[PDB]
Design an enzyme around this catalytic site. Structure first.
Site, PDB file in Angstrom:
ATOM      1  N   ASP A   1       2.180 -15.531 -19.645  1.00 13.36           N
ATOM      2  CA  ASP A   1       1.420 -16.528 -18.896  1.00 13.36           C
ATOM      3  C   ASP A   1       0.516 -17.330 -19.828  1.00 13.36           C
ATOM      4  OD1 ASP A   1       2.319 -15.390 -16.434  1.00 13.36           O
ATOM      5  OD2 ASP A   1       0.557 -14.111 -16.334  1.00 13.36           O
TER       6      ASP A   1
ATOM      7  N   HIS B   1       3.664  -3.605  -1.886  1.00  5.71           N
ATOM      8  CA  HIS B   1       4.749  -2.787  -2.407  1.00  5.71           C
ATOM      9  C   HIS B   1       4.962  -1.550  -1.542  1.00  5.71           C
ATOM     10  CE1 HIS B   1       4.383  -4.449  -6.789  1.00  5.71           C
ATOM     11  NE2 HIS B   1       4.485  -5.391  -5.866  1.00  5.71           N
TER      12      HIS B   1
ATOM     13  N   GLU C   1       0.083  -1.363  -5.253  1.00  6.89           N
ATOM     14  CA  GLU C   1      -0.064  -2.681  -4.657  1.00  6.89           C
ATOM     15  C   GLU C   1       0.148  -2.612  -3.147  1.00  6.89           C
ATOM     16  OE1 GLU C   1       1.096  -6.260  -6.663  1.00  6.89           O
ATOM     17  OE2 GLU C   1       2.145  -6.997  -4.912  1.00  6.89           O
TER      18      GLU C   1
ATOM     19  N   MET D   1      -7.905  -6.317 -17.551  1.00 13.37           N
ATOM     20  CA  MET D   1      -6.550  -5.760 -17.522  1.00 13.37           C
ATOM     21  C   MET D   1      -5.586  -6.772 -18.110  1.00 13.37           C
ATOM     22  SD  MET D   1      -3.429  -6.130 -15.703  1.00 13.37           S
ATOM     23  CE  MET D   1      -3.539  -6.550 -13.961  1.00 13.37           C
TER      24      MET D   1
ATOM     25  N   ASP E   1       8.984  -9.196  -0.639  1.00 13.28           N
ATOM     26  CA  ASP E   1       7.533  -9.087  -0.875  1.00 13.28           C
ATOM     27  C   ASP E   1       6.894 -10.464  -0.725  1.00 13.28           C
ATOM     28  OD1 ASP E   1       9.339  -9.002  -3.115  1.00 13.28           O
ATOM     29  OD2 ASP E   1       7.623  -9.222  -4.471  1.00 13.28           O
TER      30      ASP E   1
ATOM     31  N   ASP F   1       3.501 -11.316  -0.784  1.00 14.49           N
ATOM     32  CA  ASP F   1       2.305 -11.639  -1.565  1.00 14.49           C
ATOM     33  C   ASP F   1       1.325 -12.563  -0.848  1.00 14.49           C
ATOM     34  OD1 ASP F   1       3.267 -10.034  -3.624  1.00 14.49           O
ATOM     35  OD2 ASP F   1       3.950 -11.724  -4.827  1.00 14.49           O
TER      36      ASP F   1
ATOM     37  N   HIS G   1      -0.099 -11.773 -17.967  1.00 15.73           N
ATOM     38  CA  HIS G   1       1.054 -11.348 -18.723  1.00 15.73           C
ATOM     39  C   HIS G   1       0.978 -12.087 -20.070  1.00 15.73           C
ATOM     40  CE1 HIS G   1       2.536 -11.038 -14.544  1.00 15.73           C
ATOM     41  NE2 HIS G   1       3.212  -9.991 -14.982  1.00 15.73           N
TER      42      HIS G   1
ATOM     43  N   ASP H   1      -3.839  -3.447  -6.938  1.00 16.53           N
ATOM     44  CA  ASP H   1      -3.488  -4.833  -6.683  1.00 16.53           C
ATOM     45  C   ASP H   1      -3.610  -5.101  -5.186  1.00 16.53           C
ATOM     46  OD1 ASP H   1      -2.789  -5.334  -9.341  1.00 16.53           O
ATOM     47  OD2 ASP H   1      -0.669  -5.768  -8.887  1.00 16.53           O
TER      48      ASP H   1
ATOM     49  N   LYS I   1       7.148  -0.117  -7.271  1.00 14.48           N
ATOM     50  CA  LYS I   1       7.634  -1.067  -6.259  1.00 14.48           C
ATOM     51  C   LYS I   1       8.999  -0.581  -5.815  1.00 14.48           C
ATOM     52  CE  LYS I   1       8.340  -6.018  -5.515  1.00 14.48           C
ATOM     53  NZ  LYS I   1       8.466  -7.348  -6.193  1.00 14.48           N
TER      54      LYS I   1
ATOM     55  N   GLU J   1       2.813   0.521 -12.232  1.00 12.90           N
ATOM     56  CA  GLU J   1       2.837  -0.110 -10.916  1.00 12.90           C
ATOM     57  C   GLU J   1       4.180   0.150 -10.248  1.00 12.90           C
ATOM     58  OE1 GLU J   1       1.584  -4.180 -10.967  1.00 12.90           O
ATOM     59  OE2 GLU J   1       2.072  -4.519  -8.858  1.00 12.90           O
TER      60      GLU J   1
ATOM     61  N   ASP K   1      -3.298  -9.702  -6.452  1.00 17.18           N
ATOM     62  CA  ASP K   1      -1.974 -10.062  -6.970  1.00 17.18           C
ATOM     63  C   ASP K   1      -1.248 -10.713  -5.790  1.00 17.18           C
ATOM     64  OD1 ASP K   1       0.385 -10.462  -8.203  1.00 17.18           O
ATOM     65  OD2 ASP K   1       0.736  -8.355  -8.792  1.00 17.18           O
TER      66      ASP K   1
HETATM   67  O1  LIG Z   1       5.847  -7.596  -7.536  1.00 14.61           O
HETATM   68  C1  LIG Z   1       5.332  -8.147  -8.752  1.00 14.61           C
HETATM   69  C2  LIG Z   1       4.239  -7.281  -9.349  1.00 14.61           C
HETATM   70  O2  LIG Z   1       3.211  -7.149  -8.343  1.00 14.61           O
HETATM   71  C3  LIG Z   1       3.659  -7.904 -10.599  1.00 14.61           C
HETATM   72  O3  LIG Z   1       2.875  -9.055 -10.247  1.00 14.61           O
HETATM   73  C4  LIG Z   1       2.827  -6.945 -11.426  1.00 14.61           C
HETATM   74  O4  LIG Z   1       1.608  -6.660 -10.728  1.00 14.61           O
HETATM   75  C5  LIG Z   1       2.409  -7.533 -12.768  1.00 14.61           C
HETATM   76  O5  LIG Z   1       3.580  -7.676 -13.589  1.00 14.61           O
HETATM   77 MG   LIG Z   2       1.192  -6.394  -8.634  1.00 13.45          MG
HETATM   78 MG   LIG Z   3       4.508  -8.207  -5.164  1.00 12.08          MG
END
Ligand SMILES: OC[C@@H](O)[C@H](O)[C@@H](O)CO
Ligand SMILES: [Mg+2]
Ligand SMILES: [Mg+2]
Ligand SMILES: OC[C@@H](O)[C@H](O)[C@@H](O)CO
Ligand SMILES: OC[C@@H](O)[C@H](O)[C@@H](O)CO
Ligand SMILES: OC[C@@H](O)[C@H](O)[C@@H](O)CO
Ligand SMILES: [Mg+2]
Ligand SMILES: [Mg+2]
Ligand SMILES: [Mg+2]
Ligand SMILES: [Mg+2]
Ligand SMILES: [Mg+2]
Ligand SMILES: [Mg+2]
Lengths: 388, 388, 388, 388
Positions: A57, A220, A217, A88, A255, A257, A54, A245, A183, A181, A287
């Site tokens: 970041d 997601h 993702e 990316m 979520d 991760d 980002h 992702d 979600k 993306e 991710d």
């Molecule tokens: O749930 C958060 C998302 O996965 C982010 O990490 C995007 O991938 C990038 O902004």
């Molecule tokens: Mg992501």
């Molecule tokens: Mg996530």
């Protein structure tokens, strides 16, 4: 036997993943911040191909143009030193309080204008650094309550934003594509474009649809209880899988991760099978968040495990597809017939074909077993490496 | 005060809804079958506008052309006697064992051909009876296991099927449109086109997209934990809401098919608000099941309650939107600004506008409250009729 | 290398599992009924230890005492011929329409009395056949609506029922224990005693708690998104795991009853690890449904795969626990410290221990990593058999 | 007409609720911190009865005994000035990094000892301030991975902790009871004692069970898709509802902490009906978070709405229960029969009663309708105030 990644495997990581300090809704940071340069280095040593970022970041928010420049050059130097790429990039439109009601679909018009300018600024940077894909995760586009957001007006605003970004990119001559993306929720109660299918449909309404694809993702789609390999097949079928992702998620909840391979393991197996089969050639981007229980040694262990689990699943899926007994089971389950046109002979010949209706033996058809359970146990034996 | 439906309210019911005998995966029928003619009658007396049917609800499977004709004429006579209409019809491609692996995407090619012929036969019938919408719910299109179904090949087969149906309809000169009904699971482990967004995206790949829209169902999207009014706004925004199935669902679990208003009540309120606001003019169709605890008196009570709850919510949503205090709260939350273009001045003027970035006061912006909680409590007071 | 079951492995199957004809809420039977005698036979040949039954699986409902006797003796003869055992039995209080509002907690008092008599009759039979466990799954005890059921009164009725069954068993001198099977929903909107924890708590209110334990089912707890191995550890900790039903489930949706190993594979791994570690000695019972896509060859394939997957996971979990590197990682993550009393020195010594508070270095404590990610990747390597 | 709270309504709020600054996993604080004294004041003016606190909300972590004293006296003065009470208090064992693997069941023994000392210190304080209930939410007790936590050992440690707290309280002569708050996940992947039933069962294993009850939370049970009013009836039935946390949640997803009344509205209605019917006399505590979109005016609006919605639902539930037509529908659905013993005549008379089996007319029983749909629509009409 063993499974070491090479940069040829195209494994990439966001700076925010291994750099996550461990802050969650109920707890303080458990790890100190990581210098981006240090992450590039460590990731390079683990076998990674590249990193992503980002804008925030890399360049701390509110940075003078001066400080900006110094941050970019140290980063660039790390990339030259290691051979790491930046395939990316994306914009942070969710952390700062100004984005509490969204970036591109915030009710306040001046916030939507600011979100576009912040985005445009980072596209120029991503292009300089050589990124080929610009990701957009509209984390704050959504609502906690029904009256707060007219969703047709919000979709108009969202289309307006992406159409302007496309105009910008085309007028600059930039070679970069966007990946939306989806979600379904978190951190808004409901987020707009909640699944891969909603994002695919939205794209078809944009002025230049060919500039836009999706960045699905794992976790997601599983937060909506959906089958991720299925959603990915639909995106592949539409020609729109521009990036992906990877992580792990245990079902419908916040979520998590988790590292890739964790969460739903069979789903991971079927996903790797499909990506490798379909010839997906983009980055394999992780991710994910090393759990806050971990110190930095556990962070790099978690990062290594992402790669390791992908490489193990790829070997088991290739073994499965190459197994003559599996190829026979696939024909027994009529996967070959699925790939044949239903009615290449055309509508009139179908209507004229008495074997398709008047004389079709429905009872004999119904009695044929699909043999899917034997096929699935072969897939299971292969995944567990139990092919005695 | 009170809320009696008239046929002008366009309330419609499937024969299979009030006719559900109460068989579930763990239990035998608790009610006797209903004669279609009897249902038309009873529904007419309750204030309904029309009914819908699967081919197999009306004409028992394996019926001679002779018996077929008698079933249709008794039905037709009931419709003439009551003034009831038949605005929509559909095909049963899920009950007979021949469809255990799907209709249009069954692995067996001969089953896919039979499914098309069965469908074409009922489109002619629906057109005769005057239906304007033909619904397709691919209940058996899907898988319980990853290897059983190549989803790209299945999507090819699904597109092939719908493209042939579109060719048929255009070559016959029929005035009928198709509406695809998504569902995420049940009775397959995962069903293809699981949500409104996946169906919208799929449609854009068909040869004549303008013949196809969606038929979303309240409980189906809630089975994926999705916000149904949001999904409906996206369908409205795309111009594709051709029909809608109304019922109630308590969250993510098996599809309950509760009467409309039951399940998520606030969601029902926001849905009625949007349909009435957007000027949706199609049938308000109830696809629901009177609980198997009920006898036939409870069946008609359940059916009446569907209509009653819609009419009560419509009154509360109209009162909410007409309330000057709510219109002020909407402006306080900047709903009016959401509807204004972000950058009607164009890309170059936005890039040139220092107030959009260089001089934007982000801290003052962030400090403004959205006032959504006061707006939501006004919506709640109106729904509960507590506007003291 | 390979994994053949023996009757020593204690694998058992309900007659209703392999005998499921494939009827689901949207579809007709796809397989013909199986004779119980034929199932006993086929299962015996596959390596199974025994079978279980509902009264109605064995003796068709409304059977004369005469027909009853003939059904039991043919069954008994099959058991003598094969060496198969009958370790558990249960009552069907959910299929017949009389149970539409429940058995033990039906609002109608005469139905509750009938449900007890039907149950008592089958306990005598189970005892004759040698069963050691009587299972009770209150599938119809629950509601679709809030006013339909006063839950305190229903719990009173449920306790009353189980207390009477306990009085019966003790007065007969029977050596049999009861196992309550929780499920959160389906086929009622909400079922009473929805999870292992609710059933454990309920048991403590019975007159003779020692006669009652739980029969948890993999898919049931996962339908509430709960961690099944955790729920099983709590039941083990309480001394109440009397039986267990094994199958697979893909997340929060209708109960799929997939073969064991399918669904959440890592969860299955951790479950086998715990059962084998804790020395669980009861039957490993599979309560599952071969998918309706299958013919009878796929039914026995599905049944074999249940056993096969258990035996593969048991080998990988034993390898994991026996691996010296894993035993070192467990100490690195301080599993050994978890098993030590927090304060064996007692309350006063704890209050007096300045190292526990006044002088505790909280910052050094917080900095220690738990090393869980490396431990979890070792578990993953072992499960995939990738221990290079 | 209108619905103003009085302190007699026993409405209470945690300092952390209205004081939540808006930090979430993806975003920075959007509101400035609130002084506890200011919250007491504002809440008092809104009609609240009292407030609650974590030790760390009141006394910032690492405070000298000196600073501690000043914080308590300013607080105490605010309470004297306003008449506000402090009926409950609790310990923060989740925010500081030292608790990343748990407090009472952390693998590190020294952390478990510190967690007990931190807790004991705040029980003395709560007793001074007059609290009658001490809540324990073990937010960090749990795991993200199967090998990280032996759950039997963790349950041993958890019981050890609560048993020591009970010894402490009894040896001090304190009049305070404990209430365990379950939650299924978040912020750990799975949390121990995930639901009301697991906590109820656990309590029965403690040395002095009578000192412990539960503090269930609306959103927590709904995060597992469970019926909260049902879980509350079970807790009431066990005599263990010692406190309750009220808020709103939209289904199975991250815990939203919406104001009470938001989320599942019918569930809220049935909950208020049960609490008022059962004579629950504890505080009505709101554990909720004003959305981060809001400024402080929206915070107090959100807080007021919690109270308002409870008072509106209480009026509609009392109207429902007092309605003679509803009392007739309840008898028609045989709620009165549910409350009668099934077999007050005893086991032998039941076995001897031919009307309970040999001569029971099961077909006539099955045919009786339960009339639940008409009852539920009366409940719906009352909730919407549409009793024409
Ligand atoms: O749930 C958060 C998302 O996965 C982010 O990490 C995007 O991938 C990038 O902004
Ligand atoms: Mg992501
Ligand atoms: Mg996530
Ligand atoms: O879940 C079942 C579906 O809702 C069907 O009732 C379709 O609407 C019609 O085939
Ligand atoms: O969900 C169905 C239950 O699992 C039953 O099969 C019980 O185990 C036996 O009545
Ligand atoms: O999910 C968070 C919990 O609800 C806490 O707020 C407890 O109630 C108090 O520690
Ligand atoms: Mg449905
Ligand atoms: Mg429908
Ligand atoms: Mg089941
Ligand atoms: Mg079972
Ligand atoms: Mg909470
Ligand atoms: Mg709480």
């Amino acid at each position: 036997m063993n499974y070491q990644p090479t940069p040829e495997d195209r494994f990439t990581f966001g700076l925010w993943t291994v750099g996550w300090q461990g802050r969650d809704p109920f707890g303080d940071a458990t790890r100190r911040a990581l210098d981006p340069v240090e992450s590039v280095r460590r990731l390079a040593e683990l076998g990674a191909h590249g990193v992503t970022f980002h804008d925030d970041d890399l360049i701390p928010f509110g940075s003078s143009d001066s400080e900006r420049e110094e941050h970019v050059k140290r980063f660039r130097q790390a990339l030259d030193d290691t051979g790491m790429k930046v395939p990316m990039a994306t914009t942070n439109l969710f952390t700062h309080p100004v984005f509490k009601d969204g970036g591109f679909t915030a009710n306040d018009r001046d916030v939507r204008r600011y979100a576009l300018r912040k985005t445009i600024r980072n596209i120029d940077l991503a292009v300089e650094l050589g990124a080929e894909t610009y990701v957009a995760w509209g984390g704050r586009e959504g609502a906690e309550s029904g009256g707060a957001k007219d969703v047709r007006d919000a979709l108009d605003r969202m289309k307006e934003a992406f159409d302007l970004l496309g105009e910008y990119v085309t007028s600059q001559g930039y070679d970069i594509r966007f990946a939306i993306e989806p979600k379904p929720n978190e951190p808004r109660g409901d987020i707009l474009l909640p699944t891969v299918g909603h994002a695919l449909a939205f794209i078809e309404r944009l002025e230049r649809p060919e500039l836009y694809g999706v960045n699905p993702e794992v976790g997601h789609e599983q937060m909506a209880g959906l089958n991720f390999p299925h959603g990915i097949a639909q995106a592949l079928w539409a020609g729109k899988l521009f990036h992906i992702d990877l992580n792990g998620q245990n079902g419908i909840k916040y979520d998590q991760d988790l590292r890739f391979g964790a969460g739903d393991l069979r789903a991971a197996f079927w996903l790797v099978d499909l990506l490798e089969s379909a010839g997906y050639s983009g980055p394999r981007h992780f991710d994910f968040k090393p759990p806050r229980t971990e110190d930095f040694d556990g962070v790099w262990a978690s990062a290594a495990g992402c790669m390791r689990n992908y490489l193990i699943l790829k070997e088991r899926a290739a073994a499965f597809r190459a197994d003559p007994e599996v190829q026979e089971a696939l024909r027994a389950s009529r996967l070959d017939e699925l790939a044949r046109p239903t009615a290449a002979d055309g509508l009139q010949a179908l209507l004229d074909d008495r074997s398709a209706f008047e004389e079709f033996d429905v009872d004999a058809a119904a009695a044929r077993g699909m043999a899917f359970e034997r096929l699935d146990q072969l897939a299971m034996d292969h995944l567990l490496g139990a092919r005695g």
